Every structure is written in C-alpha cells, then in structure tokens.
Design a protein around this ligand. Sequence first.
Ligand SMILES: O=C(NCc1c(F)cc(F)cc1F)c1cn2c(c(O)c1=O)C(=O)N1[C@H]3CC[C@H](C3)O[C@@H]1C2
Ligand SMILES: [Cl-]
Ligand SMILES: [Mg+2]
Ligand SMILES: [Mg+2]
Ligand SMILES: [Zn+2]
Ligand SMILES: [Zn+2]
Ligand SMILES: [Zn+2]
Lengths: 252, 270, 69, 47, 48
Amino acid sequence: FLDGIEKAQEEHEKYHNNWRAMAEDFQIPQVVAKEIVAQCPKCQSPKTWQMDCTHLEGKVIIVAVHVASGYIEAEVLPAETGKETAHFLLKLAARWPVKHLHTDNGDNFTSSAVQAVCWWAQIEHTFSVVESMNHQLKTIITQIRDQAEKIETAVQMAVLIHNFKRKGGIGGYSAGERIIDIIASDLQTTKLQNQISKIQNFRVYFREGRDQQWKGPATLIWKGEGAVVIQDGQDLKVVPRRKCKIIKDYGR
Amino acid sequence: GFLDGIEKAQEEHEKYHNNWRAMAEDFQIPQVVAKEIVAQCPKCQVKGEAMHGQVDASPKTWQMDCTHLEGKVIIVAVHVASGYIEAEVLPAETGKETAHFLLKLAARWPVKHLHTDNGDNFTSSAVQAVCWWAQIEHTFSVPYNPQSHGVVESMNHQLKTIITQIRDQAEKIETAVQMAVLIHNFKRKGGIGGYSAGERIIDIIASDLQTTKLQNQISKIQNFRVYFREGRDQQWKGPATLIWKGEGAVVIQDGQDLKVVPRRKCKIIK
Amino acid sequence: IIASDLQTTKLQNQISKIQNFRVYFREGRDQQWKGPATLIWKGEGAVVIQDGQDLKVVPRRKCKIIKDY
Amino acid sequence: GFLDGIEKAQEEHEKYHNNWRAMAEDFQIPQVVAKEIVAQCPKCQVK
Amino acid sequence: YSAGERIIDIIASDLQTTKLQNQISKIQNFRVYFREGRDQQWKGPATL
DNA sequence: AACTGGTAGAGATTTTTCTTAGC
DNA sequence: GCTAAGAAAAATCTCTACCA
DNA sequence: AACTGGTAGAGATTTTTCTTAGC
DNA sequence: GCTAAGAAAAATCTCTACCA
Ligand SMILES: O=C(NCc1c(F)cc(F)cc1F)c1cn2c(c(O)c1=O)C(=O)N1[C@H]3CC[C@H](C3)O[C@@H]1C2
Ligand SMILES: [Cl-]
Ligand SMILES: [Mg+2]
Ligand SMILES: [Mg+2]
Ligand SMILES: [Zn+2]
Ligand SMILES: [Zn+2]
Ligand SMILES: [Zn+2]
C-alpha cells in the first residue's frame, strides 16, 4: 500500500503521469492519485460548440459543430431571422450540454432573441473549423443527391453518413464515439471531485508509535476499512485506524 | 353416493349458473367435479389471468407516440434504457412529418429497434422507406393495448406536468415544449445511479462500446478447451470455449450459447 | 402386429394429451369475449391463437386457457 | 370434460364390472368418482 | 521471416500475456442492474 | 370540527388426506 | 402390524379489471 | 411459432452520524 | 480518556394517479 504510494510519487517525480494511469498501475485508490497530481507545481473544452449559416440551392442551411470531436447537427431554415436561429439554439441546448457558443459577427447571431435564449439557458456567447465542416457536408450532399427528392432529406442523410459511417483519426473512430467518450470522461471527473470535497471536510488527530500524545491536525484523504491515509507536513502517510481520531472541521 | 347429485348439479348450473362452491355445498359432490361443471360452460369464462409482462430494454431501443396539447400535435420519442426524451411540434399528423422526425433522430443517435402503436402515421410507406434506408427494425404493439409501450405514455404525462409548470415564462407552445425537454433531460435527478437522463444515456452507450472492445481483446488470445457432460442423458459434447473458471462452477460457451456448469461435470484440456 | 398397435395408441395418447388446449380471448376496440380457439404459441406476456383460420396475438392478461384433466 | 367419461364408465362397469384404477386410467376420470362407481355396485367391492 | 517481423511478433506476444491478466479485472469492474421473473423492480448491482 | 374503495375470480404455493409397498 | 414415500385433493395467498 | 406497463413523488420505518454528559 | 444515551439527518420501502 504505502510502497505503492512511494513508487507512485517517485514515478510521477520522474515522468509526471496522470492520475488514471497511476491508479491503474500502482493499485491505489483514485482520490490518492488525484492528490499526488494536485500537489505538483508543474501540473497546475468538452462543452464548446461553433455555429454558422450557409447557402445551397437557394436554401439556408444552419450548421452546429462540436469542436473537440467533429460532431455535426444541421437544419434547413425558412429564413434568416433571429427567431429561427434562437429556436435552433434552444433545441440544441435542450439536447446536448452546451456551455460556450462561438459564432461570427453576423446579423442574426447579434440579436435580442438569441441574447434572451443565451440568458435563459446560461450560455456564454463569444464573437470572432466550421468552414471545413461546410465543405465536407457539401461534398457528401452532392455525393448522395440522386437518392432524395427534397433537399431536407439529403441534408439529414449526409449528417447520418458523416456522424456514423466515416472513420478516421488515431484509432479509426467515428464522430459519435468520440463525442460520447469525451463527455463520459468529463462526467467521471466531476463525480470524483464531489467525493473529494466531501471527504476533505474532516480532520485527523493521530498518535505515532512509542508515544502517548496526539500529533497535529492532519487532513484526511482516504478512510478505508482498516487504514487511514492523511496529508501532514506536505507528506502523505498511512496510519492504522486504532491510533487515529477523525473529527469534523470548521475552517471556512 | 353423489352421481345423482352430479346430474342435478348440471341441470342447476344450466338454469342458474352457480359458481363451484354453491354446487359443491348444496349437492355434496367433491370440488373437482364442481370446478369441471363450471369450466365446461361458455356463458361463464369472462376473466383474465391477472399478471403483467415486461417490455424490452435493450440499449438501442426507442419508443414513439403522439399527443395533443392546446390544439397542437406533439410527437415524443423516448430512449428506454435511460429515459432520454426528444420531442417536436408537428404541423400535421401525417406520415411525411413522422418520417422526417424519425430520419433526424436516426441521424443524431444510434437507433436499431423502434416500437410504436398502430396509428395511421406509423403504419405508412414513408416511415417504411426511412426504416429501410436507415436499417431499423420496426415493431408494432398488439392493437388497443397501450401497456405494450408504457415508457412513452408515462413520459407524455411527465412532459405535460412540466409544461404547465413553466407555461408563463414563454409566449408560444413550441418554446415551452423545448424548455420542458431541457428541464427533464438535465435538471431532474434520481433513479438508477442518481443520474439525470442525459448522464444515463452517456453512461449506457459508452459502457456498451467499452465492454465490446475489452472482451474482443480478451477472447482473441484464449485457449483451454472444456469437454462437459450434461442433459437428461449422460452424453459428452464437443469443443466448448472456457470463459471464466470460478470457485464452484465454470462458464462455457457452446455453439454461441452461454452455460454455467459445475466442476464435477467438466474436464479442461489445454 | 398387435403390440405395434399398442405402442401406436400409447404414443398417440401422449401426443393428444400434450397440447389440446382451448382459449377464450378478449379483443377489438370494444373488448368483448369471444369463443374457443386453438393455442399455438405461449410466451411470457402474450399468446398466439388460431381462430377461424386467422392468427391473432393476444396478451395473457386478456385471455383464459382451459386445459384437460 | 370427463362428464361423458362418467356416463361411459357407468355403462362399462354395468357390463364387465371393472375395478376403479382401470376405469380411472381408461376413461380419464378422477379417482373419487371411479371409487364411487365401484362402491355403488352391490356385487363388487373397492380393494 | 526477417528480423523485423521476428521482433514485432515477440514483443506483441509478451504484451498480450500481461494485458490479458489486467483486462479481466477491468471488465469485472462494471455493474449490472437486472430483472428477474414476475417482479417489476430492478435488482441491485451485481458484477458483470 | 365527525370523513373514508370494494368484490370475486384465476393461478401459484403450501398443507392435509389416502393408498400401497417394504420391513 | 408398523412406517414412510408418493400423489391426489383441498386450503391459503397474492394480484387484476370494472364500477357513468 | 418470437410478445410483454411504467415513472416519480409523498410519507413511514429503519439506519447512520454527531454532540454532550457521566464515570 | 472512554462509553453510552439522545436526537438529527439520511437512506430504504411501500403505495398512488395519470398517460386519447
Ligand atoms: O388510451 C390511451 N392512453 C391511456 C393509457 C395509457 F397510455 C397506458 C395505459 F396503460 C392505459 C391507458 F389507459 C391511448 C389510446 N389511443 C392511443 C394512444 O396513443 C393512447 O395512449 C392511440 O394512439 N390510438 C391510435 C391507434 C388506433 C387509434 C388511434 O386509437 C388509439 C387510442
Ligand atoms: Cl392501437
Ligand atoms: Mg398513440
Ligand atoms: Mg399513447
Ligand atoms: Zn507533476
Ligand atoms: Zn355457467
Ligand atoms: Zn360391479
């Protein structure tokens, strides 16, 4: 156990590993490995989208793209007012978690209706990838145009072929697998951070061997079934449970 | 004896239609005879068997239905294993708009199985052509039995309660529909893992892909075949693939079927 | 000759006593009870019956299956 | 139903005076009514 | 075979052995919620 | 401040009764 | 003659639809 | 021959956590 | 310093209406 913590600290001092790899290699819990990463001075987005409008056959196609994965959602608009752009943004924010929207300085994007939608759904709008996505979508649309009667069917068939049928990148994944893996990794991070804060609201008085007195207040990191890991004096150490007292702390 | 009582009980049931306890007490026949007299009458037998079944909950199954609100037509689709909702307002209840809603849904999320009722928009050639092109299995419920798709009708109820909660913050009904979808998907927690519906659909689909890749890498380097003895007759079946050897039993795969066999009836050969 | 007819009558007795069931079901928009039909397949939740040379699927909650002694 | 079996077994015991296990296996009636058919005959006895 | 195919095959087989022993525990770190017969509540977290 | 769901049947599970073979 | 295995017949327990 | 009720909230009961007095 | 009573806060279990 403590040998695993010592090997993890020496290996991070050499190579600066991440906490998932250290927890899987050295067989330590994840809160301990995250503390080892968080104590290092040299070691201290999944919700950003971009939007644009374009033209095809006299129609208006609005395109939104998830940036870290390349994931496309598109639609055909009857006009280019601010109310239709606000309805598209409200549908997108109701289906995927959107926190940061990046657009250009168009007219319909600089509007009171889009501003009211961003106020209600709590999005950060920023005015200045989508050009490459418009070119790629237009090549697929021309590649499958003879199978559809209307332009709306061809647009949605091209979105399906782009998202699930084209493979590339490092491991040969599509865009849907990449967006799902990215958001799932972020969810794991936030749940572990909630556990970390709830544990770190405590305090530990511990008694070393060959002494009767209690030492200073060390902060609890992990409380197991038979052992207790504490941080004290910028040092992580493992004390048995029969030489410890854990009390609540009020130091806000 | 009671054989004359059997004859009088048959005449009595032919006139009055007694239940079995009345005949078994008034004619002093055994209860099996009285139950048979009642069971051979067609004017009786008006009662079901009092149980419920259980719908399909595979990780790529969706259910779809339509509802009405303030003179409009809403169309609701639910992901069954997680509870994830998509919804829209249709200008008409035809088959063209239903085919376009299904095409957009199949472009956004992976759909392989769809369950619907027998309305005129879901049994249509446009929805048939979209399911053919996008490779979906479309199944229909038993007619006039809404319990076969209980998840989407329960979500009709939840959507209407949220819409009445936030009705005064919007002007039109399409705005209030999309605000209700956001509040259901992301602002309500509680359930299997303490998740919301968006977190649950992310966890379910990511877990599906991860576990296929892991057991592909495990099974591509396996060995230690197992010959096992099972059945009513003590025969011996051929090459089976050992998957996991445990404290008490082993797990084998035979002809693409999973089986759990104890250690006394199997022999491992490297 | 006689013993073969004894074996044939025994096997036909077991075959006839396996699956001679009657089904009273309830179907339609106005859910009325209808006459006896022949059971074909019985799964958990629903059954498939043959009535008047027509196959129908009824749930097990809307049908009664009568066996023989 | 076995009600026609009860009538047929009564005719058959009136001819040949069967026992009760024979009638209960041949005519597929329950054992209580077959024992009662043997009990009502003044010449036979259930054994 | 030449030398490059030999060195690639050797390191690949060694990696497959050690990663097998880790991947089994990795696949057993999932949790399953299941349903038995004629009971309509989802039973607790068994292990896959 | 003084009001309110219930009835009966279809199967499943547990218990009692009855015949017969073995020691 | 006494005892126990096996099966038949009876008793109890849980669950469902319909009543404007 | 291959079909099927479910979702989420209001209380009641059981369990875990936290402070303080007594020996 | 150690132990137990008491109460607060959290976790589990049973039951209901509505969905054309
Ligand atoms: O009675 C309904 N719901 C209430 C309810 C429930 F949801 C779940 C339950 F367990 C019990 C319930 F009483 C209901 C009725 N119908 C339709 C519905 O979708 C629907 O939900 C529907 O679409 N059709 C189309 C197909 C043929 C035509 C048009 O008649 C039917 C009527
Ligand atoms: Cl229907
Ligand atoms: Mg419907
Ligand atoms: Mg419905
Ligand atoms: Zn570092
Ligand atoms: Zn009757
Ligand atoms: Zn006689």
